[PDB]
Amino acid sequence: TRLSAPVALAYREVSTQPRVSTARDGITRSGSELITTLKKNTDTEPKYTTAVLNPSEPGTFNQLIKEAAQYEKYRFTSLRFRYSPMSPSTTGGKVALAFDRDAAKPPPNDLASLYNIEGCVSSVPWTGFILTVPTDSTDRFVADGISDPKLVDFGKLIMATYGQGANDAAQLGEVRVEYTVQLKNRTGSTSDAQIGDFAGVKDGPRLVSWSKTKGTAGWEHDCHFLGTGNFSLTLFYEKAPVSGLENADASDFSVLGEAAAGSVQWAGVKVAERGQGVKMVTTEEQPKGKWQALRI
Amino acid sequence: TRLSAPVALAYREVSTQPRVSTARDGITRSGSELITTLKKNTDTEPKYTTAVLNPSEPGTFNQLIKEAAQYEKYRFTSLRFRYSPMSPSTTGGKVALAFDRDAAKPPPNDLASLYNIEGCVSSVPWTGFILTVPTDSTDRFVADGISDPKLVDFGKLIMATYGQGANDAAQLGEVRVEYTVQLKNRTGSTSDAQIGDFAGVKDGPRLVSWSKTKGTAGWEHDCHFLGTGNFSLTLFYEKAPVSGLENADASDFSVLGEAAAGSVQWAGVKVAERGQGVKMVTTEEQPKGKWQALRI
Amino acid sequence: GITRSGSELITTLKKNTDTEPKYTTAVLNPSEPGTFNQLIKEAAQYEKYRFTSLRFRYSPMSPSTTGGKVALAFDRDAAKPPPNDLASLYNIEGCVSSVPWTGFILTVPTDSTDRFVADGISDPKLVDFGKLIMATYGQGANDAAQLGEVRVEYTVQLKNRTGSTSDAQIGDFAGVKDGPRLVSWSKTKGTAGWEHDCHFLGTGNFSLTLFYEKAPVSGLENADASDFSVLGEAAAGSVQWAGVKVAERGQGVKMVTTEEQPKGKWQALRI
Amino acid sequence: GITRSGSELITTLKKNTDTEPKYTTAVLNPSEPGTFNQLIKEAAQYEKYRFTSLRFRYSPMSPSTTGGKVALAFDRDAAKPPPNDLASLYNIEGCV
C-alpha cells in the first residue's frame, strides 16, 4: 500500500555513558565513537574511506586508545557501525558500508566487486542503517609498532559514496562505532608517540604512514596522517636534504626549524580530513634520520 | 615479656588486579602503585623526597594517569601508603611518612617540625608500617597546566630518612600507594605532553619544572624532571643562546641538534632518580622559545 | 607428539651495586639457548610447541643480611624492550618480588594455542610465548656476589616432527649463519683495524673454530670470558681451535684483521 | 618419564653376487649411533629405556629383474656372532 517519503529525517544523537567493568583476566569496555563524516561524490564509481578496527588506532578510536594503552591483548566481543543521515530526501546516490576481514587489502576498484563483500549493506544517503559484523574468539596483540596487519588487526571498515547529483548536500552522513572490547593482560603504561626512522621502523600508535615516490628533484617522502586533528612532527636530518618540510595538502601547516646536516625541524601540522599530510625531498633513497609524530 | 628480634623480615609483594567499575557520574578505580625507594641518609637531619597526590601526576601515578586523561575531576575516597622494608635488622636511623595537605609548602627544615605534622608516622627502617590519610568529599580538577596547587592538588606525601650509620644498606625500603579514586565528568582524550615557553606557561601533565638562577655566564634554566624514566625534550630558541643543552646531573643524556637563532634541539634525557635534569644558559632573562617534554 | 615436563636453570642473578635497577630478559621459546639447556635438543627435532604448564622459581643463595630486592614478571609481548623504571615493572600483571635471601614463585597462566618453534628471523609476536624479566636493585657494597638462581619448571607439548637441526652453528664472517643462535658477531673499526668480536648468548663450555684465508693482524684473544685457551696458529690459510668458558651472557673473544668482512669460516658449539 | 615414537633409517642394503649370506648387524640400543641418528640426542638425557613397540620395515628399491633374497632376523643376544649358514639364519625366531 501507500508509503510516504518525508522531506527529511532527524535522528537524535546523545553521547551515552561508557560501561566499564572488571573481569577475571582484564576489563570489558563498551562505548561508542565517531569515525568520520561521508562526503558527496558526484561520480558513478565509488570513493572509499577506510578505518582499521583495532584498539590503539587513533584514526578509529579516540577514547579507547588511552584505555588500551595499559593492556596487551584485545577481543572485540561485539561491534556494530551505524549511519546517521544529515541530508534531505532529494539527494541521489548511495552509501555503502562493508567490513573486510583483511586489513591490508586495498579497497575494491569497481562497484560490482564492492557488493560481493560479505555483509556489505547499503541504502540511500537520507536514511539510516546499521552494519553488524560477526566476531570471533581469537585474541590479538594491540598495535605497538610495524607488524603484519593480518596478525594484529581484526579487520577494516570501508565506506563508499557515489551517484550523488551536482546540486546535493555537501556531506551526506556520519558513521558511528558501537563496540564492546575485552582487554586482557596488563603492562606498564606505554607512551602514545610514534617514533621511527626512514628505514621502515615504527614504534608506537599508527599516527603516520610514510610513502616514497621517485621524482625529478629527488625521492619525496609523504607523511600521511591517518587521523584527523592537531599533530606535531619533529624531524632530524643526518644529511642535508633538498628541502625541508612543506605543506602538501594539509591545512594550517607551520614549521620552526631549518634544513641542513644535523638540523632538527618541528612542524605543527593540522589535519581537516584523514589522509592529508606534508612532504620532504631528499637525493638519497632511504635517508638516515628520525621522526616523531604526536597528537598535540 | 620477651620479644625477639629477627635478623631480617621478608615481605611478599604481588601485583594485585585493579578494580574498575562504573557509577552514575563516572568511574571508581582502585589499585596500587610504587612511588620510589628510600635511600640511606648518614646524617642526623632529615632528607626529604616528595610526591604530589593528584591523578595525572607522572611522578606519583604511572597507570592511573592514562585513565584520568579522559576525565575532568577526581575525588580520593580512600588512599593509604605502605612501607616495605628491604634492609637487615642491624640498620639504624628511622623512616618517616607524613601527609601535608598543602602541596606548595616546602618540606620542613628540622626533625622537630617534621613530627608536628598531623598523622606523621615513623618506624625503624627494617620494619613495615602504614600511613592512612583521612580524605574529604571535595572535587578537584585534574592537573592540566599552570595553576595554584591549593586549588587542584589534594596533598603531598613527604618521605624522610636519617640516622643511618656509615656501614648500612644502600637502600632502606620502598613506599607504595593504595588508592581508590572517583573520576567524574568526561572530555575528549587529552595528549600527555607538557608544552610551554619560558614565560611561565605550562600546558599538560607536570613532567618538568624549570628554575632560573643568575650566573656569571648568564641565566641558567634547569629542567628538573619530577618523574623517573625515559624522557624526550624538544627545544626551540628564538635567539642564539650562550650554550645548548648540557647534562646537569642526569644519566645517559644525548642531544641531536645545534644552538643558534631559529634552531631546534632534541634531547633524549634519561633519569635514574627524581629531581635530575639538564640545563641551558642564555644572556636574556625570560628568553623567547618553546619546549615540549614527553615520556619516550 | 610428545609431552616433556622438566625443570632447568635459566641463570643466577648477581649483585646490583649501582643505583639503577638491572633487567635481564629470557625469551620463552623452546629453541632459545638463553633460557633452555636441555629442551633445546628435543625442540630441535620438532616445529611446533604449546606450554601446557609454565612457572618460575627463585632459590636464594645470599646470606640473611642481604639488602635490596629481586623481582620476576612475565611479559606476553616478547618484542617489547625491558621496562625503564621500577613502577612500570611492578605494574605488570602477576609481578612477584621478595628479598634476595628468601625464595618465591611466579605462576604464568597458559593458553591453548600452538606456535612455531623459533627460527631467529620471524616476528617474535608470532612464534614466542612471551619473555621473563628479572630485576635486581638496592644492593650495597657489603652484599654477596650472587643473590639467587631463577629456574623454569615447565610442561611442553612438542608436535609434528622434522629433520634434526644442526647441533653446531656454522657461519661466515660478515655473512650467512645457520644453526642454533649460539653466538653473534659484531664489527668495529679501530687503531689496528677492523675488530670482530663474538658474544655468547648461552652460558657454559663452548668450542669456537675459525679459518682465515689471509693472515690476520692477531689471533683469538680473550675479551671478557671466564676461561680461554687457544691451541691453533693464526696465519694465512690456517685454522684456530679454541675453548671458551662463559659464566654470564655477552662474554666472548675477539680478533683483528684490518679488512672488513674477511673471507673465512667459523663454527660454534656448546661442549 | 617420557614416551617417544619415530621412524629412523638404519642403512641401505647392497648387492651380493655370492650365494652365501653377507651379514651386517645393528645393535639395538637407544644410544647407538649406528642404528639411531635422532633418538640418541634424546636418549643422552635419560639412563633407562624400555622398547614398548618395535618393527623393521624393508622398503624395496631395486628393479623387478633382480634375483637373490634379503632376510631380516632379530637376535635377542647382542654379542652372538651372525650365523655361518642359511639354515641357522632361518632357525632364528621370526626371521622373514
From Swiss-Prot, chains A, B:
Record note on what altering residue 153 to N does:
In strain: Infectious clone UK
GO BP of this protein: symbiont-mediated suppression of host innate immune response
| Keyword Disulfide bond part of the UniProt annotation | no
MF annotations from Gene Ontology: RNA binding; structural molecule activity
Q: Where is this motif: GW motif?
A: 218-219
Q: Where in the cell is it found?
A: Virion
The cofactor required is: Ca(2+)
**Where in this protein does the record put region S domain, virion shell?**
27-183
Positions of region (P domain, projecting):
184-296
Q: Which domain of life is it from?
A: Viruses
Answer whether the UniProt record assigns the keyword Calcium to this protein.
yes
According to the record, cofactor stoichiometry and binding are noted as: Binds Ca(2+). Ca(2+) probably promotes virus assembly and stabilize the virus particle.
Q: What quaternary arrangement does the UniProt entry report?
A: Homodimer. Homomultimer. Interacts (via GW motifs) with Arabidopsis thaliana AGO1 and AGO4; these interactions inhibit RNA silencing ability of host AGOs. Interacts with host TIP.
Q: Which family does it belong to?
A: Belongs to the icosahedral plant coat protein family.
The protein's name is Capsid protein
Curated annotation (Swiss-Prot), chain C:
What, per the annotation, is the impact of changing residue 252 to S? In strain: Infectious clone UK
Does the keyword Ribonucleoprotein belong to this entry? no
Please tell me where this protein is predominantly located: virion
Which residue ranges does the UniProt annotation give for the motif GW motif? 193-194
Query: GO annotations under biological process?
Result: symbiont-mediated suppression of host innate immune response
Q: Which family does it belong to?
A: Belongs to the icosahedral plant coat protein family.
General function of this protein: Capsid protein self-assembles to form an icosahedral capsid with a T=3 symmetry, about 32-35 nm in diameter, and consisting of 180 capsid proteins. Also acts as a suppressor of RNA-mediated gene silencing known as post-transcriptional gene silencing (PTGS), a mechanism of plant viral defense that limits the accumulation of viral RNAs. May suppress other innate immunity by binding to host TIP protein, thereby preventing it to migrate in the nucleus where it could trigger an antiviral response.
Record protein name field: Capsid protein
Organism expressing this protein natively: Turnip crinkle virus
Query: Parent protein range shown?
Result: 81 to 351 of 351
